[PDB]
């Protein structure tokens, strides 16, 4: 089955331990990032091999250490399933080292480990992540060999730095981190070398693989190269009776829940079999007569009258429809379809069938025609013969890289609710005032989350909530780890960085105090 | 509108109601019975909590709380049911008409004042709260009291007091030979007399068409899902209410019954020890998770505390241009936010100002939404929604905010890499022509849920002992015949242009 091997290269030299007052130590940030990685890997029950190598350690535990080379590098953990032991090592009994080291030796050691341990089992993808401050001397004689080995092995590489490529600094606060002028000449050379290697390996896009600890703490980037792809749903988009185009639909957006589920266990003895649940059916009589399951029958309420409706009868009279249907009911102007009416709990991205030039070109033509005419397709969607049919809207979505249809369910007449709301614009009692409107305009201007950048004449997002990981999973993993490591201990408080990432940048907060005070004084609000 | 709805069906029993002006034409009594049955069936589904009554006047037999003469209250105000529908249908056919004539009577004098008094007493009998009290008169006589002026005056005054009380009277005039005229005698009896209905009507009332139109859809009174507090700052807080203008329709839950007698049964769930068998309190049990060889133990209170970040409400964040809100970033059905004003005074003014400024600047309020206590927060965008009304001043888009949930990073799934293949301009033009051929106008309520409609039809057929269910027309089907007729050969030339000669798009 699908598998992935990841080796984490951690810098440990004393240079990383240095920090400025009011700034979190880079070692702590790297520890937090790796803790999140291991927590997700272990608590997600995914078959991903995790190994840990630290460079800069005082001791030397490395197969290639022989020959007085690649010293001060320790292969703490080889390729194996993540375990609570690794988390305990990272959190508690791992300490900074007093000796510096070159990250190129760590790269060589990681490549050797990948090559030696990969032969055992099949590995779809191989990944390396390197956390370092790039504040140590390195030799440039290994560039060609490193590039050739990486290309031959075809293993993804990610770099994490204390800074990204003036209020208080907060972890993942959607604000500047490690203010400028704090980069040394050695750090400049390290940035240049990491940029060059990333460009050579990947290219321009590779330039985006140099993340920062604060950014990585609130971006989900660490799992970008390890996340899998959901299975595809194949069908045939049919306009009439003759024209048909083979298509595959993926779930572009779907609410993410917790796979693991709690189960009740007796407090005295923590065994599943101890607790048993039984259901009994009894009549509405004084004797509380009991009946068997086979005796029960199904019925429905009909306005104070109950009509029996057997399950077999329901199946016989059930609405039967051919399954796996994706047919175009018609085409309508995009204006008619409104975002307010979208229903369902998923969005489908529909591409052409895998490795099919004819279907691909047909779907491209359909998408281009819909975009040119500014139209959408009202279609009938059915996952299978056992799924209720749905009426949805498919609209084009064209990008410089890929083009595809986007399907979202639409409501029936029953679903719609007819609620009448009193008008507010004409309400004389609640009418606003010119001063109030000006104050509200000032408040809105002071709290804009988008900046109009004139250098590119575009809109830059300051608070892109779409990229923020769900805090619930992180909180659950943190609390589970704390309970496992400390059985007798109250649950820890929410991590500070989670709150920082769940809040807007300090700039808008500090730039909207006077407008908010003006709104408060102008608008009278009293509890009633 | 708070309370229930009460409706009384006044059906005339005069000989004019029992006659066929022409062959293959149901008599006025049969038409009234059909309308009553249709209304009962529609109320069973739309709102079963309403109250319906059936009263017959002009029959020899009498049955009223006042013990009046020539008035029979067939069914007092009560919730609709299948038994009432069957009783009404018992008189549906010609044999039913004969049975009604024999058991009830015919050709008896009456007084409009007496029937209005009976209806008022029936309304007073109900102990619930009636949002609307309505009476429907099914008569085809222009001048029930033409010989005696005193009776006509008594009826007029009784109708006047009934209208003053709050009872809404409607006249469902049926076809009569000479012609029905409201202006003659019923002009002052109807609570509202439309100027249009002043001539003589030679056909049935237009309201019968609406009454006979069955509706299969659960109609629900407006109800705020939750009243929360929008917090611009720590101190600046306004009270808002959240509604679900769009909500999925689910079939009524099944009910367990005893097969032998078909009566409701009580379901009980218990937990006992496999070794002791005694009842276990919630405190006794504990929540645990297994991760390989490691077990983690937590309690219910700890599990609830796990997912708890902030108190319920809408914590306002900065504003975002509407452009940055992608239309395809849909996660959950949207909600509607409207100022409450019943919790904090002055919130309506601030809400209106915010809506106006957001519309002027074309921005949306980004907020952290926490519906209930101990629930993870989500990110939502409140986009302004100005009031929109179609012709004849009927509102279609209420004013307020539309709340749309923005998906998190984990809610998005990566798509597999696909090589992009472009289409030549000729193919794009042919598809544009095909799409233009298949142009159609879409409305939000142009389709019906086939599953729910079929379930309702089957339930009605079973309840009413019908011969067979009424097959539901599937409006969701593509009606491919019309599409083939319209497209002509366009499909063929497109396929020959784009599809290779040997493609076989079937396997």
């Amino acid at each position: 089955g699908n598998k992935a091997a990841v080796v984490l290269c951690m810098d440990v030299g004393f240079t990383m331990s240095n920090s400025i007052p009011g700034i979190e130590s880079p070692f702590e940030q790297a520890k937090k990032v790796i803790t999140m990685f291991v927590q997700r890997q272990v608590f997600a029950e995914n078959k991903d091999e995790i190994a840990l190598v630290l460079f800069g350690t005082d001791g030397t535990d490395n197969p290639l250490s022989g020959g007085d080379q690649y010293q001060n590098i320790t292969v703490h953990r080889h390729l194996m399933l993540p375990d609570f032991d690794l988390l305990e090592d990272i959190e508690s009994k791992i300490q900074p080292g007093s000796q510096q080291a070159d990250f190129l030796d760590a790269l060589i050691v990681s490549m050797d480990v990948i090559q030696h341990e990969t032969i055992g089992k099949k590995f779809e993808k191989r990944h390396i992540e390197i956390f370092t401050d790039l504040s140590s001397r390195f030799s440039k004689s290994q560039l060609d060999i490193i590039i050739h080995s990486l290309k031959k092995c075809d293993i993804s590489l990610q770099f994490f730095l204390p800074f990204s490529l003036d209020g208080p600094f907060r972890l993942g606060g959607h604000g500047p981190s490690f203010p400028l002028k704090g980069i040394t000449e050695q750090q400049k050379e390290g940035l240049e070398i990491v940029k060059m290697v990333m460009i050579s390996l990947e290219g321009e896009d590779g330039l985006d693989e140099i993340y920062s600890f604060s950014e990585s703490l609130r971006k989900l980037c660490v799992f970008k190269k390890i996340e899998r792809h959901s299975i595809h749903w194949p069908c045939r988009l049919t306009i009439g009776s003759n024209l048909s185009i083979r298509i595959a639909a993926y779930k572009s957006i779907l609410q993410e829940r917790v796979k693991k589920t709690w189960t009740v266990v007796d407090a005295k003895t923590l065994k599943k079999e101890d607790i048993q649940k039984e259901t009994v059916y009894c009549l509405n009589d004084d004797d509380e007569t009991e009946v068997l399951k086979e005796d029960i029958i199904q019925g429905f309420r009909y306005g104070s009258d109950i009509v029996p409706f057997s399950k077999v009868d329901e199946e016989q009279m059930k609405y039967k429809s051919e399954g796996k249907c994706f047919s175009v009911l018609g085409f309508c102007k995009s204006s008619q379809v409104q975002r307010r009416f979208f229903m369902g709990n998923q969005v489908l991205k529909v591409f052409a069938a895998r490795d099919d030039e004819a279907a691909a070109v047909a779907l491209s033509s359909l998408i281009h025609a819909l975009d040119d005419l500014d139209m959408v397709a009202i279609v009938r969607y059915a996952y299978d013969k056992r799924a209720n049919p749905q009426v949805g809207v498919a609209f084009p979505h064209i990008k410089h890289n890929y083009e595809c249809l986007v399907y979202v369910q639409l409501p029936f007449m029953e679903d719609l609710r007819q609620y009448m709301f009193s008008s507010l614009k004409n309400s004389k009692k609640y009418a606003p005032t010119e001063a109030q409107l000006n104050a509200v305009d000032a408040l809105i201007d002071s709290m804009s989350l988008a900046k109009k950048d004139e250098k590119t004449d575009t809109l830059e997002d300051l608070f892109p909530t779409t990229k923020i990981p769900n805090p619930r999973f992180q909180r659950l993993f943190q609390c589970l780890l704390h309970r496992a490591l400390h059985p007798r201990e109250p649950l820890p408080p929410i991590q500070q960085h989670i709150w920082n990432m769940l809040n807007p940048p300090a700039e808008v907060t500090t730039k909207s105090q006077i407008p908010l005070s003006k709104i408060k004084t102008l608008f009278p609000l009293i509890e009633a | 509108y708070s309370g229930r709805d009460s409706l009384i069906f006044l059906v005339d029993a005069s000989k004019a109601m029992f006659e066929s002006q022409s062959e293959d034409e149901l008599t006025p009594f049969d038409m009234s019975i059909q309308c009553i049955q249709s209304v009962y069936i529609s109320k069973i589904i739309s709102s079963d909590r309403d109250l319906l009554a059936v009263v017959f006047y002009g029959t020899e037999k009498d049955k009223n709380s006042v013990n009046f003469k020539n008035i029979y209250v067939l069914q007092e105000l009560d919730n609709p049911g299948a038994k009432r529908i069957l009783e009404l249908d018992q008189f549906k056919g010609q044999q039913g008409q004969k049975r009604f004539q024999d058991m009830m009577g015919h050709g008896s004098d009456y007084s409009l004042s007496e029937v209005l008094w009976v209806c008022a007493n029936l309304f007073s009998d109900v102990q619930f709260k009636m949002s609307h009290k309505r009476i429907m008169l099914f008569t085809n006589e222009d001048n029930p009291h033409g010989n005696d002026s005193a009776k006509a005056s008594r009826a007029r005054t009784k109708a006047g007091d009934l209208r003053d009380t709050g009872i809404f009277l409607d006249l469902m005039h049926l076809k009569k030979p000479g012609g029905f005229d409201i202006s003659l005698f019923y002009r002052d009896i109807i609570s509202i007399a439309e100027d249009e209905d002043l001539r003589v009507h030679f056909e049935e009332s237009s309201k019968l068409e609406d009454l006979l139109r069955k509706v299969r859809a659960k109609e629900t009174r407006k109800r705020a899902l939750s009243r929360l507090k929008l917090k611009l700052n720590k101190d600046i807080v306004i009270s808002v209410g959240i509604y679900n203008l769009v909500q999925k329709a689910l079939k009524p839950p099944p009910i367990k019954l005893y097969r032998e007698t078909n009566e409701p049964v009580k379901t009980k769930t218990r937990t006992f020890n496999t070794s002791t068998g005694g009842l276990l309190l919630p405190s006794d049990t504990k929540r645990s998770q297994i991760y390989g060889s490691r077990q983690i133990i937590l309690e219910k209170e700890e599990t609830e505390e796990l997912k708890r970040f902030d108190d319920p409400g809408l914590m306002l964040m900065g504003f975002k241009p509407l452009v940055l809100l992608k239309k395809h970033h849909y996660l959950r059905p949207s909600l509607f936010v409207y100022p409450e004003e019943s919790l904090v005074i002055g919130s309506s003014t601030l809400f209106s100002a915010l809506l106006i400024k957001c519309l002027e600047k074309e921005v949306a309020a980004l907020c952290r939404y926490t519906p209930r206590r101990n629930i993870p927060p989500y990110f939502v965008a409140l986009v302004p929604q100005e009031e929109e009304l179609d012709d004849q001043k009927i509102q279609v888009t209420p004013p307020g905010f539309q709340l749309v949930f923005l998906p998190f990073a984990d809610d998005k799934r990566k798509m597999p890499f696909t090589e992009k293949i472009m289409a030549t301009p000729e193919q794009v033009g042919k598809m544009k022509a095909i799409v233009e051929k298949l142009r159609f106008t879409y409305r939000s309520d142009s389709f019906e849920n086939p599953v729910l409609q079929q379930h309702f039809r089957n339930l009605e057929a079973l309840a009413l002992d019908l011969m067979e269910p009424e097959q539901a027309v599937d409006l969701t089907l593509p009606k491919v015949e019309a599409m083939n007729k319209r497209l002509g050969s366009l499909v063929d030339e497109f396929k020959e242009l784009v599809y290779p000669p040997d493609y076989n798009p079937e396997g």
Binding site: L329, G330, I378, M413, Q418 | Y1, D5, V39, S42, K43, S46, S47, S131, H132, R134, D170, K207, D210, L211, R213, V215, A217, E219, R221, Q392, I394, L438, R439, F440, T441, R443, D445, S446, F447, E448, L475, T476, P478, K479, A482, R486
Partner: peptide, 23 residues
């Protein structure tokens, strides 16, 4: 007031479902 349903007062009489009607 206009368009009110005689069965459920307070709710406008919804138009019958039409489906797809090509122009």
């Amino acid at each position: 007031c206009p368009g009110e349903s005689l069965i459920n007062p307070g709710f406008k009489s919804k138009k019958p479902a039409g489906g797809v009607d090509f122009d």
